[PDB]
Ligand binder design. Structure first.
Ligand code: FAD
Ligand code: FAD
Ligand code: CA
Ligand code: CL
Ligand code: CL
Ligand code: PT
Ligand code: PT
Ligand code: PT
Ligand code: PT
Ligand code: PT
Ligand code: PT
Lengths: 655, 658
């Protein structure tokens, strides 16, 4: 019928959801564009995906190709701009070769290719005259790109590069859109010329004929197999690729940063390689933004279902969302979704700054921008992945059904923790940055940026919190001092133990676990500080900033409790004060409780996008669960196929 | 071919693996029977399951019926006993109706049926002349069984029970084997007679005809839909069931503890009601035991792959370091390896408890019933939660390749996770433990002292006011130092919750307000139990060169890991100082370095066949990369280099013909 059975929950909102929608979107323009394209996608039959778990691999892949072709057509017929086109693909919500073509193939050519190469290849790529992928990872090397085995040797006699896969472990493995779609690809391999290896470089290589799509000579290509989850990435043709002395023109090597003349000499271009932040600053900011998007979808579903599902506490039973355990599990995730959203905005400013930095030839803040962004990507993706699975558990047994929308969300998102850098490896980079920074404590150098709080090491290392009552934990200065002292203490303790070993790189390895935790503490401090900073801005809407303030401190006090041991080790926070922080946290859960549903409605997700029976906008769950069950292929017949051969003989006692 | 790439790793072992295998199995008999049946399943083509993710729902279900039928045949042709049959189904490793028939339907009739009911129905069930399922859960009620809406009203004039589904939410939902297989089922509904509701009772109801499998009159049954993961529980026909005033003979009501005369009189039997909890203590015991099974599988895979995978740390010109050498990898994996053994041993203890409770229960001795229930519920919650998270963490430990279905980890996680919800929601179960702990605290050792697993709660004297004597890292390897720390931490948290409760006018209101705190205290109590049982295990005589030593390493890794993970809880007691906490961390680090060379052998002790593990990354011989390529070729998407859909959806795009 469409009647909203959560209207009573929404009426509890102490703020206008419409205003919060703008805050979440980031601006009115962003909201309007996304909302329009979203409705557009939802109203198009070709983009349906509620039966995505009832199709075979082949059928799922073909259906994906169809959606992509249809999307391209709609973009042209509707004359959608870049922004709208990007939102269209976003709401189609189905991993496809197109994501890598536009997301890695093109960008790789723009930043690593010469102007002429860009003119030629970008012209073909932008008009879909060719389809490319990013072939970097191999069977034996993913995170350690410097260890790639694929080789590219120049042939002075033919002025061509010989691309070869020395061993089976040198085979490309994982590239999206490589398995069956891409006609071309940017292949990364060891550059070899004049009998010398000059490291990893990118080379454009045609994989398939543009006439029959058949693999070119000496090219071995295919899909790597089924991946985790029903649907999810299985719509993507992640593939492998091997070269048997494949030849490509010399000028097919991306030569913006370095080039190889006809003579075969390697010549590092005069371009500042420090401008390679197009693959590790903006890209990671989108990853951090994607985390808020993924987490918000999961929290939206779990919040609505928690307000619908009643169990125990009876006549009528209590809504599970009323239970403090449900809140202590769900509300921190709702706070994290907003926290990551805002930290994602700050990362947009950092990009505009780092870009502003590579202008005046200032590379003084690059080291911090690298570790900061790397640590944030690791922190948010990890927290988001865990939160999505937790949201599934918060839905009890029904969350185990695919139609709940949670199982596939986790499966499709989890790769974020590995691609573009293993989460642990990335945090080790932050640990190295923090150790190099602490090594400056007492040197006289004034640390700036996210490490500026290290200048107050004198006070932070010997502090004592002035907290005397629960409400004191709502003071930004009190919370910030707590997190800074915690992070500093942890980093200083690591540095001190690191000087207790003879070999520096040895002690580092021996303490990797402690180093990662110190790095995480630093990253959480950053997220907490950016949420507080966001609250200083002018946010319109009655009661809006009050709810954001509630979420800000729920996030901070939740992490305080989760990592209580770190704070208590610093002795700048006592157990009594920790207990008071816990009382404040509980009080914050109660204040947010009535605003819960409206806070996820602010995400403005359509039922089509959420693709969840439990998280339906109208709260009409149970009837929809039954409706979906009937659609399962196992219900195509009353008596199962296999009854006569494998059941009746048993029941009838005939073996 | 036949080379063992992990040969060197296995030579690093500082203990004899063959002896550790016996420890894991529990005995030489258990080990022998399992090893034999395991090989028997692996060698049978009908039991292939590495292609499971390439089957449609229908083909997967049909294949499941085939495997179960073949199992019945093999048990008869091989003349296998009950133990062997159980091990057979265990290694077939495929969720199916058979699990509920033997695991729930039968146990229900045995513990709730009358002597006359048991020999009539169990004779049918044991011979499989009927196939039953456990139909309790409904759309609207799972954890809260007392809230079930299905009704069973007696009809004196016909001597029948009228089973009915009041509303859509009253529909049975989730029962394994109900969807398409079961012909009968034990249905739970509110017993209605003489115009009174007497609560939830069990009733036997026939769902399908034994001649053509057609649903009986007024019976609406079907499958509830596709579940999380490729394969996994999708071979199981979990279903829904609605009754439109279905009628069954009055004698089809399980009447061992409750009778209903021909005149509709509700009369309790002479059998103690508590003589039913004996089965749940069993089912929960099997769940805990299952936790070690699933966790060890995941850890075996991640441990072997961690020894094969090399990344970064290149020394000898290109020779990169095995990831298992990195402390972060060890800190994430070794605690799970330690937990696998910890859960195995706590599972052994829970078995002993099952018997003990069952014995005394047969003598109307319900003195330890309250404790038995708390431990079981809490351990079921603790182990399943830790195992589920541990399995997913093992997948992340395998980096990118762990995302491939052929790594064996994605399906293992999906098939295992239901463990955190079935038999009671994990958080709900821990709240029951909290209530038990609060009552125990309420009884201040004045009336009858705390014994069993709560005995420590009696020594609140020095506990709530201790100061560990730890002065050196090595001190954290002392059992009394560890136990004292965990007992104090748990008792302290519980006593604090009790005090905070006492300051509320309405005790139930306070309980609800502090739910989160109560669950944390209950978890600390359950962890103490696991730690204490592992330490107790080491007090036994365990033969084998270096065997006990390695178990000792794991024992303290488990304890010290939890101490670190929940550091905040211990530092609040003032019985542990930050300096002593830092010493525990140093000891933990050292234990990792000691376990490192023993890692691969410690997972080989599980004695899993490659067929059972069904993992390319975790292959016994470590021949990962070549096998990954081999598996990729089997995907249907590789049936052709040019994908179907190319002509319609790719060519037109590449030619600007949209
Ligand atoms: C769905 C998906 C899509 C992808 N798409 C593409 C693509 O389009 N193009 C492309 O080129 N690639 C792609 N990739 C590959 C991806 O970008 C990464 O290169 C790859 O996932 C890195 O993981 P790995 O297997 O190398 O992990 P590893 O780096 O081998 O790590 C494995 C384990 O060892 C640990 N470890 C490793 N090194 C260290 C260290 N130094 N210290 C401590 N611990 C360490 C890790 O933490 C982890 O526990 C994709 C991957 C996935 C899963
Ligand atoms: C794969 C699978 C197979 C199953 N097979 C069977 C079967 O064969 N037969 C059968 O009868 N059933 C079966 N079940 C059902 C199962 O045994 C449980 O009854 C059911 O999964 C419990 O989940 P729920 O939906 O009731 O969760 P709920 O109990 O409703 O909980 C949902 C959320 O609310 C929270 N919550 C609920 N109550 C409280 C409370 N009092 N205090 C604080 N928080 C609370 C929970 O923590 C959770 O976060 C199966 C379930 C699954 C997933
Ligand atoms: Ca309502
Ligand atoms: Cl799934
Ligand atoms: Cl899966
Ligand atoms: Pt050039
Ligand atoms: Pt960078
Ligand atoms: Pt309705
Ligand atoms: Pt080999
Ligand atoms: Pt009877
Ligand atoms: Pt019980």
């Amino acid at each position: 019928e469409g009647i909203d059975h959560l209207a009573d929950e929404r009426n509890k909102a102490e703020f206008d959801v419409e205003d919060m929608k703008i805050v979440w979107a980031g601006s009115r323009h962003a909201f309007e564009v996304s909302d329009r394209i979203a409705r557009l996608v939802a109203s198009d039959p070709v983009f349906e995906k509620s039966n995505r778990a009832r199709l075979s691999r082949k059928e799922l892949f073909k259906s994906t190709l169809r959606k992509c072709a249809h999307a391209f057509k709609r973009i042209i017929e509707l004359r959608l701009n870049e922004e709208e086109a990007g939102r269209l693909r976003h709401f189609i919500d189905q991993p496809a070769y197109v994501d890598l073509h536009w997301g890695m193939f093109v960008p790789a050519i723009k930043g690593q290719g010469t102007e002429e190469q860009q003119k030629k290849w970008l012209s073909l790529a932008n008009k879909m005259q060719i389809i490319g992928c990013y072939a970097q990872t191999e069977l034996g090397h993913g995170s350690n790109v410097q260890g790639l085995e694929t080789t590219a040797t120049l042939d002075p006699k033919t002025d061509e590069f010989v691309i070869h896969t020395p061993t089976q472990t040198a085979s490309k493995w994982w590239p999206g859109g490589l398995g069956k779609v891409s006609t071309h690809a940017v292949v990364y391999a060891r550059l070899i010329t004049n009998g010398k290896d000059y490291g990893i470089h990118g080379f454009i290589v045609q994989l398939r004929s543009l006439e029959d799509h058949s693999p070119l000579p000496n090219i071995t290509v295919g899909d790597i197999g089924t991946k985790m989850g029903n649907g999810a990435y299985n719509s993507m043709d992640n593939g492998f690729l091997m070269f048997d002395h494949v030849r490509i023109p010399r000028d097919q090597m991306l030569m913006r940063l370095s080039k190889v003349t006809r003579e075969g000499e390697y010549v590092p271009s005069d371009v500042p390689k420090q401008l390679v932040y197009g693959t590790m600053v903006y890209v990671r900011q989108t990853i951090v933004a994607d985390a808020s998007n993924a987490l918000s979808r999961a929290v939206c579903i779990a919040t609505r279902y928690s307000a619908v599902r009643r169990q125990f506490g009876a006549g009528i039973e209590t809504q599970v969302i009323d239970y403090k355990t449900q809140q202590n599990r769900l509300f921190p995730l709702l706070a994290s979704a907003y926290a990551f959203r805002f930290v994602g905005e700050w990362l947009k400013w950092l990009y505009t700054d780092v870009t502003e930095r590579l202008a005046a030839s200032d590379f003084a803040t690059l080291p911090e921008a690298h570790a900061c962004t790397a640590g944030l990507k690791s922190l948010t993706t990890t927290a988001t992945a865990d939160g999505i699975e937790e949201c599934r558990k918060l839905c009890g047994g029904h969350g185990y059904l695919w139609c709940s929308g949670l199982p596939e969300l986790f499966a499709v998102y989890v790769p974020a923790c590995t691609y573009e850098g293993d989460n642990v490896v990335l945090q080790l980079q932050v640990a190295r940055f923090l150790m190099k920074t602490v090594a400056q404590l007492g040197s006289g150098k004034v640390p700036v940026g996210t490490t500026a709080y290290m200048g107050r090491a004198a006070h932070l290392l010997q502090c004592r919190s002035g907290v005397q009552k629960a409400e004191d934990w709502l003071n930004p200065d009190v919370v910030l001092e707590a997190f800074e002292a915690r992070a500093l203490r942890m980093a200083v303790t690591c540095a001190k133990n690191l000087s207790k070993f003879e070999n520096q790189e040895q002690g580092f390895q021996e303490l990797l676990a402690d180093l990662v935790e110190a790095a995480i503490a630093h990253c959480q401090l950053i997220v907490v500080s950016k949420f507080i900073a966001k609250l200083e801005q002018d946010i319109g809407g009655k009661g809006v900033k009050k709810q954001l303030n509630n979420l800000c401190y729920i996030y901070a006090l939740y992490l305080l409790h989760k990592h209580l041991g770190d704070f208590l080790s610093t002795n700048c926070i006592t157990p009594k004060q920790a207990s008071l922080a816990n009382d404040q946290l509980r009080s914050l859960y109660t204040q947010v409780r009535p605003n819960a549903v409206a806070l996820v409605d602010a995400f403005n997700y359509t039922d089509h996008y959420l693709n969840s029976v439990l998280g339906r906008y109208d709260g009409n769950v149970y009837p929809k669960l039954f409706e979906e069950a009937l659609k399962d292929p196992l219900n195509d017949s009353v008596v199962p196929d296999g009854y006569q051969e494998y059941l009746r003989p048993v029941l009838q006692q005939q073996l």
